[PDB]
Amino acid sequence: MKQDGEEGTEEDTEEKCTICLSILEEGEDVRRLPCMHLFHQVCVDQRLITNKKCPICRVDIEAQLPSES
Numbered sequence: 028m029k030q031d032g033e034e035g036t037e038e039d040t041e042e043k044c045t046i047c048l049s050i051l052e053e054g055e056d057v058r059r060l061p062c063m064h065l066f067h068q069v070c071v072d073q074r075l076i077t078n079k080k081c082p083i084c085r086v087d088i089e090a091q092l093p094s095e096s
């Protein structure tokens with residue numbers, strides 16, 4: 028009949044959690060690191076608990092803390 032061969036378009040590092048390997052699109056808490064990288068607020072505070080440096084940007088992601096332990 029019977030297409031359309033159809034995309035958004037625009038789908039590059041826009042709203043995509045590369046931690047939990049899934050796209051977001053609507054209402055999600057996003058957080059962007061100081062090293063310019065946007066991720067999901069939950070998963071960034073999962074993978075980057077024990078690590079705190081952009082693997083390419085070479086900037087510390089914890090940018091002050093200011094916790095303890």
Ligand SMILES: [Zn+2]
Pocket residue numbers: 044046047048067069070071
């Ligand atoms: Zn996620």
Ligand SMILES: [Zn+2]
Pocket residue numbers: 060061062063064081084
């Ligand atoms: Zn970065």
